[PDB]
Amino acid sequence: MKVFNRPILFDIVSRGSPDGLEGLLSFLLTHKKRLTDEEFREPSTGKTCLPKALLNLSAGRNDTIPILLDIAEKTGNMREFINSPFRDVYYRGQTALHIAIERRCKHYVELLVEKGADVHAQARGRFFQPKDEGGYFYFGELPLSLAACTNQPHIVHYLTENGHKQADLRRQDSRGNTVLHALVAIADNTRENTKFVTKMYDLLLIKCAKLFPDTNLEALLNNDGLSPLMMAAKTGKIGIFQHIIRREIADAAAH
Ligand SMILES: O=P(O)(O)O[C@@H]1[C@H](O)[C@H](O)[C@@H](OP(=O)(O)O)[C@H](OP(=O)(O)O)[C@H]1O
């Protein structure tokens, strides 16, 4: 019947036309193909049509997204489809969830986590000099650390509190950095930055203590052997450094 290939699929998805996907499920089942197959991924990056959809929004929406996820499910492919990684010059291991978070799409984030997105997928930075030139924007690799570092408390709440699959607040990336180290990494000592970073830091610190009363999140060490406080001191992050100190002092005064 209707025939689908990569340029056709990507045309439909980049325009955001749900009607264009009529016939695709039947096509995939009849020809024994999957949306993760090489023929339906961008050769240069590894993107399936899912990242393509998320990068092509109209008023924040692309109605092919729910349809593609359903098609992936019905072809026994849902997990692989959702979590299929891609790369560019800056990161490898990027997933659809990273895109949905970076584009601030709360609804798509929920949809993807509900249908089995890897809440701990790591977008690892790429470098081209012999010592990491830091050409990429570092946010701690993980979806939770991305949400935190981009000032999205609702997504932070969702990712840690949802009933399907929760991001672990204690998680560490490839540098050994927890979300707290990541917040320190992105701190730049400007007023609005210092304001959201300290608020996010405390929200996560308190939430960790509540869930794991035995556990002090700001005690966990990165691979340099540094706590967030000490990383902050070493890297000149004055505003967050000072806030952690006053908070530590206030916390002892409480008891
Ligand atoms: O400074 P705060 O207190 O952290 O407030 C956040 C700020 O307004 C963000 O710009 C916003 O993201 P949007 O631009 O997408 O609205 C976020 O919404 P969120 O919590 O729903 O992620 C707010 O929480």
216 is in an annotated binding site: no
- Structural biology method used: X-ray
CA distance 47 to 86: 5
234: tokens are 């070493």
Distance between start and end Cα atoms, the chain: 72
- Residue 199 alpha carbon to ligand 1 centre in Å: 12
Q: Which residue puts its alpha carbon closest to atom 23 of ligand 1?
A: 152
Would you say the C-alpha torsion 112, 115, 119, 124 has a positive or negative sign? Answer: negative
Total Cβ atoms within 10 A of residue 182? 27
- Residue 120 alpha carbon to ligand 1 centre in Å: 22
196 lines ligand 1 (CB under 6 A): yes
Torsion of CA 140, 145, 151, 154, to 10 degrees: 170
Q: Which residues pair with 91 in a beta bridge?
A: 125
CA distance 200 to 208: 12
CA distance 178 to 155: 17
198 lines ligand 1 (CB under 6 A): no
153 lines ligand 1 (CB under 6 A): yes
Angle between helices 191-211 and 238-254 (to 10 degrees): 40
CA distance 224 to 22: 53
- Region label for 23, one of left (φ > 0), alpha (ψ between -120 and 50) or beta (otherwise): left
Cβ neighbours of residue 236 closer than 8 Å, sequence gap 6 or more? 189
CA distance 145 to 139: 6
- For residue 242, with 0-12 CB atoms within 10 Å meaning exposed, 13-18 middle and 19 or more buried, which class applies? middle
124: tokens are 């690892």
CA distance 46 to 86: 5
Q: Measuring CA to CA, how many Å separate 98 from each of 61, 105, 115?
A: 16, 10, 15
Kindly list the structural domains of the chain, giving each domain's residue range(s) and its CATH number in brackets, ordered by start. Answer: 1-255 (1.25.40.20)
Stated in angstroms to one decimal place, the resolution of this structure is 1.9
List the alpha helices (DSSP H) in the chain.
6-15, 24-30, 49-54, 64-74, 78-82, 96-102, 106-114, 143-149, 153-161, 179-185, 191-211, 228-234, 238-254
Q: What is the DSSP string of 152-209?
A: -HHHHHHHHH-SS----TT---TTS--HHHHHHHT--S-HHHHHHHHHHHHHHHHHHH
Which residue's structure tokens are 């590894």?
46
55: tokens are 């990068």
CA distance 135 to 20: 39
